[PDB]
């Protein structure tokens, strides 16, 4: 009558982490810095676009003025 | 077992490398954008001077030829 039976106990392997808290924090800090740099680039790019738009009008005005002056001088000369 | 451990250990360094490359690119971007902005400011100053001189010269020559 040496017929034995058993029961079982369970253990849980550690969840997936303990490497997600050293590279993670550095990743977040770098992401924040990149976000700030992107915001600054946004602002600078908008300012540059405004300045180019401003330049356009003066360019067109000088072109028109020179063309009209040349035509007038030619007309009077002949 | 060790498969997931190695997978987790191998899926973190690549993010760091990509992020650092992005950082360097963005920094270079900022410097060159500042330089381009300064250049464009000089451009605008030169254009303004040129147009003002055009107006002055055309007015002067027109009045001079009108009066003869």
Swiss-Prot record, chain A:
What is the name of the gene encoding this protein? Snap25
GO biological process entries: associative learning; axonogenesis; calcium ion-regulated exocytosis of neurotransmitter; endosomal transport; exocytosis; locomotory behavior; long-term memory; long-term synaptic potentiation
The keyword Lipid metabolism appears for this protein: no
Per the similarity annotation, which family is this? Answer: Belongs to the SNAP-25 family.
Which GO molecular function, any one, fits this protein according to its record? lipid binding
What this protein is reported to do is described as:
t-SNARE involved in the molecular regulation of neurotransmitter release. May play an important role in the synaptic function of specific neuronal systems. Associates with proteins involved in vesicle docking and membrane fusion. Regulates plasma membrane recycling through its interaction with CENPF. Modulates the gating characteristics of the delayed rectifier voltage-dependent potassium channel KCNB1 in pancreatic beta cells.
Keyword Phosphoprotein present in the record's keywords: the answer is yes
PTM comment, free text = Palmitoylated. (Microbial infection) Targeted and hydrolyzed by C.botulinum neurotoxin type A (BoNT/A, botA) which hydrolyzes the 197-Gln-|-Arg-198 bond and inhibits neurotransmitter release.
Residues of the region (Interaction with CENPF) are 1-70
In this chain, composition skew of type Basic and acidic residues spans 1-15
Quaternary structure note: Part of the SNARE core complex containing SNAP25, VAMP2 and STX1A;this complex constitutes the basic catalytic machinery of the complex neurotransmitter release apparatus. Recruited to the SNARE complex following binding of the SNARE complex component STX1A to STXBP1. This complex binds CPLX1. Found in a complex containing SYT1, SV2B and syntaxin-1. Found in a ternary complex with STX1A and VAMP8. Interacts with HSC70 and with SYT9, forming a complex with DNAJC5. The interaction with SYT9 is inhibited in presence of calcium. Isoform 1 and isoform 2 interact with BLOC1S6. Interacts with CENPF.
The organism is Rattus norvegicus
Gene Ontology CC: one annotated term: synapse
Q: What is the protein name stated in its UniProt record?
A: Synaptosomal-associated protein 25
Region listing for Disordered, in residue ranges: 1-18
Curated annotation (Swiss-Prot), chain B:
GO CC annotation, single: presynaptic membrane
Tissue specificity annotation: Expressed predominantly in cerebral cortex, hippocampus, cerebellum, adrenal medulla and retina with weak expression detected in non-neuronal tissues.
Q: Where in the cell is it found?
A: Cytoplasmic vesicle, Secretory vesicle, Synaptic vesicle membrane; Cell membrane; Synapse, Synaptosome
PTM characteristics: Phosphorylated by CK2.
The Gene Ontology terms for molecular function here are:
ATP-dependent protein binding; calcium channel inhibitor activity; calcium-dependent protein binding; chloride channel inhibitor activity; identical protein binding; kinase binding; myosin binding; myosin head/neck binding
Keyword Transmembrane helix assigned: yes
| GO terms classed as biological process | calcium-ion regulated exocytosis; exocytosis; hormone secretion; insulin secretion; intracellular protein transport; modulation of excitatory postsynaptic potential; neurotransmitter transport; positive regulation of calcium ion-dependent exocytosis
Give all residue intervals belonging to the t-SNARE coiled-coil homology domain.
Answer: 2-64
Site description (Microbial infection) Cleavage, residues in chain: 63-64
Lineage: superkingdom: Eukaryota
Question: Where's it mainly located?
Answer: membrane
What are the protein's UniProt keywords? Cell membrane, Coiled coil, Cytoplasmic vesicle, Exocytosis, Isopeptide bond, Membrane, Neurotransmitter transport, Phosphoprotein, Synapse, Synaptosome, Transmembrane, Transmembrane helix, Transport, Ubl conjugation
The cross-link Glycyl lysine isopeptide (Lys-Gly) (interchain with G-Cter in SUMO): at which residues? 62-63, 66
Q: Report the sequence similarity comment from the record.
A: Belongs to the syntaxin family.
Biological role stated in the UniProt entry: Plays an essential role in hormone and neurotransmitter calcium-dependent exocytosis and endocytosis. Part of the SNARE (Soluble NSF Attachment Receptor) complex composed of SNAP25, STX1A and VAMP2 which mediates the fusion of synaptic vesicles with the presynaptic plasma membrane. STX1A and SNAP25 are localized on the plasma membrane while VAMP2 resides in synaptic vesicles. The pairing of the three SNAREs from the N-terminal SNARE motifs to the C-terminal anchors leads to the formation of the SNARE complex, which brings membranes into close proximity and results in final fusion.
Q: How does it assemble?
A: Part of the SNARE core complex containing SNAP25, VAMP2 and STX1A; this complex constitutes the basic catalytic machinery of the complex neurotransmitter release apparatus. The SNARE complex interacts with CPLX1. Interacts with STXBP1. The interaction with STXBP1 promotes assembly of the SNARE complex. Interacts (via C-terminus) with KCNB1 (via C-terminus); the interaction increases in a calcium-dependent manner and induces a pore-independent enhancement of exocytosis in neuroendocrine cells, chromaffin cells, pancreatic beta cells and from the soma of dorsal root ganglia (DRG) neurons.
**Protein name, UniProt field:** Syntaxin-1A
Organism listed in the record:
Rattus norvegicus (Rat)
The shown chain, on whole-protein numbering, covers 191 to 258 of 288
